[PDB]
Design a protein around this motif. Sequence first.
Motif, mmCIF file in Angstrom:
data_model
loop_
_atom_site.group_PDB
_atom_site.id
_atom_site.type_symbol
_atom_site.label_atom_id
_atom_site.label_comp_id
_atom_site.label_asym_id
_atom_site.label_seq_id
_atom_site.Cartn_x
_atom_site.Cartn_y
_atom_site.Cartn_z
ATOM 1 N N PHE A 13 -4.137 9.678 -6.840
ATOM 2 C CA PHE A 13 -4.569 9.959 -5.470
ATOM 3 C C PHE A 13 -3.915 11.225 -4.927
ATOM 4 C CE2 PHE A 13 -1.410 8.526 -2.081
ATOM 5 C CZ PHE A 13 -0.305 8.546 -2.924
ATOM 6 N N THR A 14 -4.548 11.815 -3.918
ATOM 7 C CA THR A 14 -3.981 12.952 -3.204
ATOM 8 C C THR A 14 -3.692 12.532 -1.757
ATOM 9 O OG1 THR A 14 -5.253 14.472 -4.617
ATOM 10 C CG2 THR A 14 -4.250 15.397 -2.641
ATOM 11 N N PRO A 15 -2.409 12.257 -1.442
ATOM 12 C CA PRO A 15 -2.015 11.853 -0.089
ATOM 13 C C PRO A 15 -2.320 12.914 0.969
ATOM 14 C CG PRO A 15 -0.088 12.374 -1.430
ATOM 15 C CD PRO A 15 -1.253 12.293 -2.360
ATOM 16 N N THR A 16 -2.828 12.469 2.117
ATOM 17 C CA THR A 16 -3.045 13.335 3.280
ATOM 18 C C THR A 16 -2.379 12.727 4.516
ATOM 19 O OG1 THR A 16 -5.194 12.330 3.834
ATOM 20 C CG2 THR A 16 -5.231 14.274 2.398
ATOM 21 N N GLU A 17 -2.407 13.468 5.622
ATOM 22 C CA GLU A 17 -1.778 13.044 6.873
ATOM 23 C C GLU A 17 -2.436 11.800 7.478
ATOM 24 O OE1 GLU A 17 -2.274 15.675 10.314
ATOM 25 O OE2 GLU A 17 -0.217 15.246 10.943
ATOM 26 N N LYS A 18 -3.768 11.780 7.500
ATOM 27 C CA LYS A 18 -4.519 10.751 8.227
ATOM 28 C C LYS A 18 -5.071 9.596 7.374
ATOM 29 C CE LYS A 18 -5.684 13.889 12.012
ATOM 30 N NZ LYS A 18 -6.744 14.452 12.891
ATOM 31 N N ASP A 19 -4.902 9.676 6.055
ATOM 32 C CA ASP A 19 -5.346 8.603 5.161
ATOM 33 C C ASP A 19 -4.294 7.507 5.028
ATOM 34 O OD1 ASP A 19 -8.049 9.143 4.288
ATOM 35 O OD2 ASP A 19 -7.273 10.813 3.097
ATOM 36 N N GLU A 20 -4.710 6.271 5.287
ATOM 37 C CA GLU A 20 -3.848 5.104 5.108
ATOM 38 C C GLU A 20 -4.099 4.443 3.753
ATOM 39 O OE1 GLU A 20 -3.456 2.382 8.406
ATOM 40 O OE2 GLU A 20 -3.932 4.000 9.812
ATOM 41 N N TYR A 21 -3.026 3.968 3.126
ATOM 42 C CA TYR A 21 -3.113 3.276 1.843
ATOM 43 C C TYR A 21 -2.383 1.941 1.891
ATOM 44 C CZ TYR A 21 -4.939 7.652 -0.077
ATOM 45 O OH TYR A 21 -5.698 8.770 -0.329
ATOM 46 N N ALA A 22 -2.916 0.957 1.168
ATOM 47 C CA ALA A 22 -2.329 -0.383 1.123
ATOM 48 C C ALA A 22 -2.584 -1.096 -0.208
ATOM 49 C CB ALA A 22 -2.844 -1.227 2.290
ATOM 50 N N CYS A 23 -1.894 -2.217 -0.407
ATOM 51 C CA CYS A 23 -2.116 -3.082 -1.560
ATOM 52 C C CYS A 23 -2.413 -4.497 -1.076
ATOM 53 C CB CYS A 23 -0.897 -3.073 -2.493
ATOM 54 S SG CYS A 23 -1.122 -3.987 -4.043
ATOM 55 N N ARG A 24 -3.541 -5.045 -1.524
ATOM 56 C CA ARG A 24 -3.981 -6.386 -1.142
ATOM 57 C C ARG A 24 -3.869 -7.339 -2.331
ATOM 58 N NH1 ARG A 24 -9.889 -6.229 0.987
ATOM 59 N NH2 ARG A 24 -10.291 -6.064 -1.266
ATOM 60 N N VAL A 25 -3.114 -8.423 -2.153
ATOM 61 C CA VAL A 25 -2.794 -9.342 -3.252
ATOM 62 C C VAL A 25 -3.134 -10.801 -2.919
ATOM 63 C CG1 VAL A 25 -0.945 -10.222 -4.778
ATOM 64 C CG2 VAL A 25 -0.967 -7.804 -4.130
ATOM 65 N N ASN A 26 -3.820 -11.474 -3.844
ATOM 66 C CA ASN A 26 -4.083 -12.908 -3.726
ATOM 67 C C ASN A 26 -3.541 -13.694 -4.921
ATOM 68 O OD1 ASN A 26 -6.977 -15.001 -2.764
ATOM 69 N ND2 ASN A 26 -4.788 -15.156 -2.288
ATOM 70 N N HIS A 27 -2.934 -14.837 -4.615
ATOM 71 C CA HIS A 27 -2.271 -15.687 -5.592
ATOM 72 C C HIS A 27 -2.421 -17.127 -5.121
ATOM 73 C CE1 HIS A 27 1.242 -17.281 -7.948
ATOM 74 N NE2 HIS A 27 0.780 -16.397 -8.815
ATOM 75 N N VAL A 28 -2.338 -18.073 -6.053
ATOM 76 C CA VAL A 28 -2.481 -19.499 -5.735
ATOM 77 C C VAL A 28 -1.485 -19.962 -4.657
ATOM 78 C CG1 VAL A 28 -0.978 -20.445 -7.586
ATOM 79 C CG2 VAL A 28 -2.956 -21.786 -6.764
ATOM 80 N N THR A 29 -0.342 -19.284 -4.580
ATOM 81 C CA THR A 29 0.697 -19.588 -3.594
ATOM 82 C C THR A 29 0.345 -19.084 -2.189
ATOM 83 O OG1 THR A 29 1.919 -17.584 -4.226
ATOM 84 C CG2 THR A 29 2.577 -19.648 -5.283
ATOM 85 N N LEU A 30 -0.580 -18.127 -2.118
ATOM 86 C CA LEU A 30 -0.981 -17.500 -0.858
ATOM 87 C C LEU A 30 -2.334 -18.024 -0.383
ATOM 88 C CD1 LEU A 30 -0.175 -13.875 -2.108
ATOM 89 C CD2 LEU A 30 1.325 -15.168 -0.562
ATOM 90 N N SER A 31 -2.376 -18.484 0.866
ATOM 91 C CA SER A 31 -3.587 -19.062 1.453
ATOM 92 C C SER A 31 -4.613 -17.994 1.840
ATOM 93 C CB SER A 31 -3.230 -19.920 2.668
ATOM 94 O OG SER A 31 -4.329 -20.716 3.070
ATOM 95 N N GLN A 32 -4.131 -16.770 2.042
ATOM 96 C CA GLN A 32 -4.970 -15.633 2.407
ATOM 97 C C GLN A 32 -4.408 -14.373 1.742
ATOM 98 O OE1 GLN A 32 -5.586 -15.261 6.738
ATOM 99 N NE2 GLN A 32 -6.790 -13.399 6.383
ATOM 100 N N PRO A 33 -5.292 -13.471 1.257
ATOM 101 C CA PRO A 33 -4.860 -12.207 0.641
ATOM 102 C C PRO A 33 -3.872 -11.403 1.496
ATOM 103 C CG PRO A 33 -7.211 -12.186 1.215
ATOM 104 C CD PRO A 33 -6.759 -13.602 1.230
ATOM 105 N N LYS A 34 -2.687 -11.162 0.938
ATOM 106 C CA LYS A 34 -1.608 -10.455 1.621
ATOM 107 C C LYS A 34 -1.783 -8.944 1.496
ATOM 108 C CE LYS A 34 2.518 -12.334 1.578
ATOM 109 N NZ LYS A 34 3.810 -12.838 1.038
#
Lengths: 9, 194, 275, 237, 100
Positions: free
Chosen positions: E71-92
């Motif tokens: 990826f090429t990071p910029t000032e206004k672009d937001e980035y995240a990581c979304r994770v789901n697991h049997v232990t989690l009731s909703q994607p974190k």
Amino acid sequence: ALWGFFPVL
Amino acid sequence: MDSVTQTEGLVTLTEGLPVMLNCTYQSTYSPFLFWYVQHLNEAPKLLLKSFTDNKRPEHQGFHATLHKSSSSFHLQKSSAQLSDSALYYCALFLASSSFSKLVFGQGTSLSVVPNIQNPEPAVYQLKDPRSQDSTLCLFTDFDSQINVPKTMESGTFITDKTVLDMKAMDSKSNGAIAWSNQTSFTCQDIFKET
Amino acid sequence: GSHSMRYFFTSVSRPGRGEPRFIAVGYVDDTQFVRFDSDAASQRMEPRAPWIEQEGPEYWDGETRKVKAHSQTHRVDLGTLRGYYNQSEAGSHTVQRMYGCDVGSDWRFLRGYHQYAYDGKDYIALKEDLRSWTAADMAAQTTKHKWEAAHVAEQLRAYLEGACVEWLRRYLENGKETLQRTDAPKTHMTHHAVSDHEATLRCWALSFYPAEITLTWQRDGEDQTQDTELVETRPAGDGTFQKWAAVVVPSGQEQRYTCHVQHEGLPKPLTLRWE
Amino acid sequence: EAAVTQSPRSKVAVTGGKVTLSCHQTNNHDYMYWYRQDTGHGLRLIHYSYVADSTEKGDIPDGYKASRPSQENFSLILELASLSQTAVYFCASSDWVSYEQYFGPGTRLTVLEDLRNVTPPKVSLFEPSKAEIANKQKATLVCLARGFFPDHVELSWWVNGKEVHSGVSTDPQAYKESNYSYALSSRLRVSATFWHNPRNHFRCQVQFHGLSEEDKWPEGSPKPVTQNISAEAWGRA
Amino acid sequence: MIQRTPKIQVYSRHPAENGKSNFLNCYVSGFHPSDIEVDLLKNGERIEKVEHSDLSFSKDWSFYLLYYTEFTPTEKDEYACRVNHVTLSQPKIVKWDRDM
């Protein structure tokens, strides 16, 4: 390199 | 690079005497060796293993001690019996860096011969009644220590000695058979040594 | 310094699929070099490091047939343990296996490993004497009795002290530029006000190899864990690793705290103070 | 309890022909192996298998193929048979403890340049020496099978319609008298009293394993198929 | 039997500089069992070309995986990581904070 003997549980 | 060397050919031994069949090997890694046995007209089966601890035993009467220093795994037994007559395979198990395989040697044929206590050597002539002038010589009841001659002439054939057992009380008979294609062939001079 | 070779095996039973899942990976120190995945198209052991690529066709055929036998064995192991614990076929279960060897800086054998987990829990393990088995429960005792009869430990000792160590040294040489390098951590500190009376100091360690590192916080030259947050050492993705440690300090007391960085590629341990 | 079976037990093949050796095993063993044995010596691995539908090359795979259609079955295939492939072939099976391998009975295979030399034995029964009967009170009958090629034979003795094993000594291996001629001999020793009884019937049977019905044979000469050939004698005063 | 929730770390391979090509990493570690869903997000939108490491585990038998994309990071672009697991009731969802 892997082991060439394959024990079972 | 990973191989087995066994005693070459036939080992002939009198009943009651100790068995000693040699096996040496070359092994890249810590060795594991096995003795296999094949009786006549039978499948090869496992006899004994090189496993512990310190060197010694497995199987029946037979035992073998692993000497890693000189790379030896010789097959031994205190007192040979006639039933011990078989083909014996020493084997190297390679399973450290490569897929589990047994590497067998050439095998050593063991021939246990009886102690003939009262030898009565005799050469007999036998006839085939259905054929004209068809005859055969039989050398029988001789000692296990004497040598039976082999063929020097074309047309004339002599077999190796065999042991016959009459379950009639104690009747071990050494025997050799000879025949030919010649006009007139004597029986006395064919079983003559060398 | 010291080096290691490890193989990691994961078998998961899949109740909604026709086959269980099997994954095998090889590591030398912190660098992965081989992989096998039962769901992948190739159905072969695959290279994952540049230096393993110099091995010939026989190596790859050898590792393929061996890992496939591992795969079949661990597939049967799932069914065996299901029977041992009297579990139904409806649920998904995980068999994990690890084995390998350690060498010292002289490249001679130090330790050997061979261990199993079922559903995250220690099942059976080879002890450091390399002759004994730690079996956790009665089910693992059944496995132990099978292995003692086949003299598995004695055969494993031959691998771990022989083949394992020999191949490790071979890899260490072929990947000399990668595996025998030592990269010192690039370090810096950051400061964040969390409230009007508290502040966070974060101590960073970047671009270091190998992964082994000790980041500790001190308050007045005295070890401080009581308020320390420590993230797991993470891979950068380029062969180097990253880690940070943070403490929540009272505001105005920043300079009373020191971060201490310990690493192999570091001639002397670094002390960092906020300025 | 672990048992391995092979088929066929005997095969005579032509050079350039197709030979399929079959192996069957119900031990629940994943590992199977093919070995060849040469002149009563050596046991060299040709092909092996650790799972159904996959086969691995052994120490000497050239000229052989192998197929593992199921856990139970393991085929050895010779597409174009050669003289060098004359040998005894053993199948084996094991579980994960692959140093304990369980062998099948074996398959005797002989490959020939042409099938014309295949010949059944002529069986002769040589009657006891009167000198032996008088001096030792024993009678040795000798069975002699000659003029047969190849050496896929089994000799048995039959007294009063029943097979006997005691008092019998048959050659362990057949003797090559000519390049295309084998000989085998055996001894049956009975007491003089037994031979002298006219009731007693003595017979030596040689089972010759030759060609199968599928093998092509030209008209004129009789086909050397698998057959039993005997010679017999009765007791005399 | 044993269930461990994943620890999620979102970061860049190299110190992020706007307009310069980099790699966005999401590191999930310490989880059990191994079944896991991981997505990298650009402005809350799923990134297509995301690769992952081969499944491995730690001394305590817990799993770890590295997910990464160039990826090429910029000032206004937001980035995240979304994770789901049997232990989690909703994607974190864990956002990329570069200035940590």
